[PDB]
Symmetry: D2
Subunit: 331 residues, 4 copies
């Protein structure tokens, strides 16, 4: 018994969610919606500059997508309320347009025949957020949920291990983040973010982010203890969090490493990773773990003040955990 | 007596035209129009990732731009017909939105009080095109003209020298072109150009262009003898034409070089350049010549089949020649 | 099965090794470079361009264990003391870029190898062979060259065009990705001043012999082609830009069909064909040494045409090195 | 006027030379590197990062004529045979990155120079001086170090923060541009495996001593700071990310005012201040070694804050090398 998913929005997250769903036997994509001709959708799925060619076959026949022998209904509806999700039997909608990030706009999917909605971004309202490895057991049957952000999915699991084992007094984070679709190729207008309109490939671009402060929502014990900011850098994919934290209980770096390794090999096997290799960003292109702890890159000034490094494929890891949230609220 | 110019569109070309106008004593910018707050316009003019900080001072006072002590009227009108160009005494409008590239849409500037219009792109209709070094003496008083494209401004002057001296039988051109504002930072929708929606910084992107065929419009003797295509590459600025030509009159490469050098030091001093240095693309960031012939990069198979290389700052060179066309149809 | 030793673990040496894991007829048994097993395992495990190694890598007693196979690791400068016969090497993939002649490569045969394939164009008259071009012209030579990555893209396309329409004369440009010889920022490069400028900032003109080398593997094209290159800020994948004059007048649609027919026929696996809106990254990992881009090309008339063909200058060339190894071992 | 010879014509050596043309108190009279005049003129003429040389460059009798001034060009490996007194060199800008100790740099004084400034952090106890930090602590030493480009950014900001609020402890990250030590594609780097990966593709963690070196130029901060770096695919301009604990509680607005006051006061020209939506390229050519980014920083509370400061790791550091030359010559 497979969970039937419709994808609203075939951007970066929507397409990588689709690609990850082909690998999972418990989740099935049955419908895609975006303002794109079916033939265009096949082209964007077939070819990916970041993640290579689609592993499988995609073709178009009679206005529908054929993906590995499976028929995908393709629609181009602007109003989510006329999506007729019930006609294809969709259980959960992966709302991935980045535009309907509130309970009232996203509820239009449930009106249109869907049973539940997962937002592939942090909610602009109080729609509950859930990060795997952090607070999945706190889901209480809500029909609209958020998977938070790609950056929160990296910070929250690492934060839990550190807090549970040593107690975080206070932490400040920087994410050295890859270029995203909202940026510009050359200096251009970006009214909502002047820095973000500067040429992405030429610049280190500071930006603000609530992802660190949002960790206090999925980890309420850390409610007012985390914040930070971002540096957008000229990479097509893969980012890394730089977490400077104060510890209540004194810990050697060797003890931090052992605590992370244990959680990575234990309760967070699929979410948190651990490495001692001389890794660089491209080594995590395709990583499913939302947080891979970089043991050698981190550094401690003393037993209570430490800087911790954790990688994440902001496309693949987040997309896989979107599916984890789909299945968690269904299974 | 200075020519008063209004700029419609403060994109890449509009801002570099503005910067080039500060260096010319015969051209004055008196008004800028775009859908941008005056403070934002000052920011985009102050800071340029490609060309550095503005050489001078820019500030905003009472909704107006103050640039080196000069007041610039700033408007944000969508309809070019309500631009009230006559209120600021604009003679010529540099139409640089890339959107009103036809006589009927651009004529709205003349209705709005302007006397003449220069399109900073190739016309979508038959609005006459003029390239400096090619056909400025063919201007016959038209009130709406086009400066063609940045690529045509590189190919046309070099084509004239080669044709005048040796006779071009036929030529095929490739422009290895820098990233432009129409491209995307990561794989994304570009309905009018699927290749152009792929991540600009990751890819060599083939594209079509009429710039070579357009040379037959500014150089009618070459009407059906030139065409070609483009490769978009991950550079923020500066492009280069790769011209493979057949010659009627046999010429050694030394004779081609001498003919180009003579025209560069003679009738085309400001338009066509010549170098024998080991130049790379960044060496022409800020180049005013629309075509700098790369002597060492070119290669000949024989005396009638030769490949010629010419650089151009697709932002600075074209912007300077836009001003040359403004002044030519006024002076 | 052919037992292969790789001399030189650079870009070509490492991608050849990765490609060899997919073929059941070729197995790598020894690697030689001045690098030591622990570093080699790291470079093989992690690749910025082609992702993580598909399989398992570990180090044991100064040797590599790769997918359960023990690889001898040596660091010998003189190929004559490489003791290839002690590890049973049949063919040597000479990939240092340094021993590109019959006399230096003969030291591999001296050290116990049977045949040698140079992963570059020969500096002497060592015969060159390109798949799809002249593999049938092999006459049992024990030292051969696989030419260059650019030649492996131009030669198959050139053959189809010449065989079908007759090339009078052609000029080629390869828009080429950044390579290891370039610098990250403006720096000294005595042998090529342009090449020392910052690779990531620049379109850099550079020289190439690949077009005239096509006249060696396709003697009918001797002295009919030349050209040059532009190195551009991409990590991998290049494309040839071939402007040619044709004897027999042909519409561009007729050119397309002739290439497609050869891609689906006599050159399957060597030459590819597409009408899709492809970009460079779509060929990262391409096995075909030449994929014809139908939509990118353009014709001025029926006798003057510009033809575009992609190639992964790492993967495609590396696979054909193995293709030549197996061909000279039959 | 101070007559300067530059040993080493790399990135720092060439940008120091360009910066010296703007100052009337310092003139370059000799350059030494294994490069020859014709190449040096080319590298000086054309720069991918900073544009064409502002002025005229030509070669005459193996020597450089730059803006009408004759520059002696030598290619001496041993600094003791550099004959600095024959060209009247007062101070030597030691910029090879190779002679970073009192005993190797003393060979310059042996060869006729009066004083030496190393354009890097000393490997021995050669005193380090950062403008805005401890220039007033110079006691006439003939060999000094200007520390690193990153130290020149952290030390002035650290001083303002410590002087005003008291730093208990700080951890710093510098998001740093690509440098000449990196590779264009995955390649051998024995001394730093991460550093051999393709610079243009990767965020690359790397080490840095710049934070602890701040404890040397600001002894009050001894053992209170450490950190590391991420090398990113930009050709130039870097930024320090300083997370600090403060003794005296301060709102972020109070921190901003304290930095702005110092930037407009005692550290004018060294420390800068902005509230604009700046990005890295806005500081390509910046003379200030540290420009505080008010909007980029963020505070968790009045005692735990993250501070952002930009630096052109080429231009800013190069200007302060000349600033140290002139300070030790007074």
């Amino acid at each position: 018994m497979t969970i039937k998913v419709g994808i609203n929005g075939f951007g970066r997250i929507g397409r990588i969610v689709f690609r990850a769903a082909q690998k999972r036997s418990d989740i099935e994509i049955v419908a895609i919606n975006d303002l794109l001709d079916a033939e265009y959708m096949a082209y964007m799925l077939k070819y990916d500059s970041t993640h290579g060619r689609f592993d499988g076959t995609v073709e178009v026949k009679d206005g529908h997508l054929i993906v590995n022998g499976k028929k995908i209904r393709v629609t181009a509806e602007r109003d989510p309320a006329n999506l007729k999700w019930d006609e294809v039997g969709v259980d959960v909608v992966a709302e991935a347009t980045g535009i309907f990030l509130t309970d009232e706009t996203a509820r239009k999917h449930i009106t249109a025949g869907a049973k539940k909605v997962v937002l592939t971004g942090p909610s602009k309202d109080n729609t509950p957020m859930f990060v795997k490895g952090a607070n999945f057991d706190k889901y209480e049957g809500q029909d609209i949920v958020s998977n938070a952000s790609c950056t929160t999915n990296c910070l929250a699991p690492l934060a839990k291990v550190i807090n549970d084992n040593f107690g975080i007094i206070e932490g400040l984070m920087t994410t050295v983040h890859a270029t995203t679709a909202t940026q510009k190729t050359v200096d251009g207008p970006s009214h909502k973010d002047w820095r973000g309109g500067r040429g992405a490939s030429q610049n280190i671009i500071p930006s603000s982010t609530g992802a660190a402060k949002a960790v206090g929502k999925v980890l309420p014990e850390l409610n007012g203890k985390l914040t930070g900011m971002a540096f957008r850098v000229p990479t097509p994919n893969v980012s890394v969090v730089d977490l400077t934290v104060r510890l209540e209980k004194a810990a050697t770096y060797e003890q931090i490493k052992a605590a992370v390794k244990a959680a990575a090999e234990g309760e967070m096997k699929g979410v948190l990773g651990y490495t001692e290799d001389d890794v660089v960003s491209t080594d995590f292109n395709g990583e499913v773990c939302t947080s891979v702890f970089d043991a050698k890159a981190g550094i401690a000034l003393n037993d209570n003040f430490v800087k911790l490094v954790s990688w994440y494929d902001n496309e693949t890891g987040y997309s896989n955990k979107v599916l984890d949230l789909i299945a968690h609220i269904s299974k």
